[PDB]
Every structure is written in structure tokens, then in C-alpha cells.
Amino acid sequence: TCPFYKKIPGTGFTVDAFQYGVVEGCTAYFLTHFHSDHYAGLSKHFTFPVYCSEITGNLLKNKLHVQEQYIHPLPLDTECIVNGVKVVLLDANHCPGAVMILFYLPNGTVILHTGDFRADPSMERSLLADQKVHMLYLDTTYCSPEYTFPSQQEVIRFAINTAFEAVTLNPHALVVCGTYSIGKEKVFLAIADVLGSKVGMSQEKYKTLQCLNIPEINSLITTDMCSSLVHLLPMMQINFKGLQSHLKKCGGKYNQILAFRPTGWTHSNKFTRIADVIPQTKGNISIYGIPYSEHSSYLEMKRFVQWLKPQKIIPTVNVGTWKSRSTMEKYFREWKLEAGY
Ligand code: NI
């Protein structure tokens, strides 16, 4: 059964609610983004209306085979009427195709559902500038002050410089990047661009990238691994055993691997600056863990919320323990007393 924080009161709508069978009263199922925890349940047998972005719609059709007749893509930044209710989709600064949803309820209440997001000051100049929000359904993944990490631009600077230095010292080094979902594509695209290479990958991953409306993509990626000196591998293979096994397959073309594992936050963030990051090394294999986040830091979250001044906040992450719920409620009250709303 569908939990309360996935229902939108006063509408026939749900958000990210496909794992509960037929939800009673639901006339339109919104999908914020193509990540498995959120789409859990969709398939070719789905026969209700799905509302989403263009990019999410391309993925539903090609990767999950949802039939065309049930996919409803909406443009961003545009007032749309759905089943008699005005809605707007906004860029969530999460993975490709990810949105926030603004719902203008028939009774005058305005609701913002963030989906998954990485808050940014640019959101203060979207269509959110114009008006009041009564309820915020918030991505609270990192709602505690210990969760710190650098900007995505600093992380990409570190990865480009690390890869360009290594391959210039040794033209016979291969670079490998881990992946397990959409998102974080800048890591492997920026590294391949500095090395003058296409990115090599499986047919399955190529198919997924072909759904993402990335400009000039045909110039950036390929399934011909032999032509490429940046390879993508499943995240599970990014370890000394998996990488040894991969280097054997490359026909003596390479004598060294440099690998990247994009993670979210890890506790080495509590001590080590991005500059000072060092790899794990065995022989001719080195592995860097880099903290490339597609969720708000504590500080980015707090800024957003203090600017928006919502009347009520409903967390959508970390909701399963009393201690997590209590901790998040305390910070919401500080933020409100500090800013005066
Ligand atoms: Ni996500």
C-alpha cells in the first residue's frame, strides 16, 4: 500500500508510486526521474497515464517498453493542465530528465515536490520566484551538517587533471569509469574530451545514453571498445579483480589502468579536501573514489528552504526511523527561527 508522502491531496495524483499495484483513486501517475527506487513497478503491461519529462519518456519506451499510448511527456518551464489541474515541471539538477513538480490545487494551495534534487541558487530565478508554496515535499538525503562535499565543477577539474597527467606520462594507460544508473555522465564525458577519445561501452549502456538528448552524442560515445581509451564498466567491476580481468581482454594494448568510482558522500569527506584525494593502488592498477553528488549538500538544502519559506515540509528520504525524523524536524525549526518565517 501507497504511503502518505507519495499522495497529492485534493487531486487524483501520485508521485513515484508504481510498486503498490492499482492505487485507489489515482487518475495520473507522475514519475520525477528514471532511477530504480522511483520507477519500481513499471513495464510493458502498464495501462495508466504516466506524466514525466521527454527524456524520462524516451527511457520508459526504450528501456522498460511501456507503450506509447500511456506516455505523456511535458515540456519544462510551461504551465500545463492535467485532468483539470495546473502543473509545471522544473529542472531538478539531478540526473538527465529529472524534474520537480509544481501543483496548483483547485482550493488555492500550491505544492512543490522536489523529487530528487541538487538545490542551486539558479532555482531562485525559475517560475518559483512568482509565488507562495504551502507544502514542500523535500529530498532530505543529506539533511545533517556533517554532509559536506565540493561543487561538481571542482570534482570534474580534479578528474580531468588526474587523467590528463597520467596518460601524458604513460600513453599506454587505459582509463576506466564505473556506472550503475543514469546520472554523473559529466565524469566520463569530460575525461574523454581532454584525452581526444570517444567513450567505449556495452550495447546496453549505449542504448541508455542514446535516450538522453545530449547534444552531439554520436561524436562522443561508441560500442567499439578497441578504438576508445576511456571505457565504461558496471560499478561492481570497479575493484582490483574486475579491472585485472578487464585489462587481460584488451589484447596487450595497455599496461596500466587508472579507474574512477563516482560515489555520493563518504566519511573521508570529513577529513580530506578534494585536492588531497589519493587512490588505492595494487601494481599497475589505481582506483580513485570521487565525491560527485547529484543531491543537495546540507548547506545548499538549507539555503533553498530558507529562500522558499514553505508553510509545511514533508521529507521524502530518511523517513523510516524515529531518530531520523526527529533530527530533520529539529533542523527545519532552526531554519525557520533563524530566517523569521
Ligand atoms: Ni535519484
UniProtKB/Swiss-Prot annotation:
Annotated localization: Nucleus
Highest taxon listed in the record's lineage: Eukaryota
Tissue and organ distribution: Expressed in brain, heart, kidney, liver, pancreas, placenta and skeletal muscle.
Induction: During mitosis. The mRNA encoding this protein contains an internal ribosome entry site (IRES) in its 5'-UTR. This 5'-UTR generally suppresses translation while specifically promoting expression during mitosis, when cap-dependent translation may be impaired.
Subunit structure: Binds constitutively to TP53BP1. Binds CDC27, which is itself a component of the anaphase promoting complex (APC). Binds PIAS1.
Family membership noted in the UniProt record: Belongs to the DNA repair metallo-beta-lactamase (DRMBL) family.
Function: May be required for DNA interstrand cross-link repair. Also required for checkpoint mediated cell cycle arrest in early prophase in response to mitotic spindle poisons. Possesses beta-lactamase activity, catalyzing the hydrolysis of penicillin G and nitrocefin. Exhibits no activity towards other beta-lactam antibiotic classes including cephalosporins (cefotaxime) and carbapenems (imipenem).
Protein name, per record: DNA cross-link repair 1A protein
Organism of this sequence: Homo sapiens (Human)
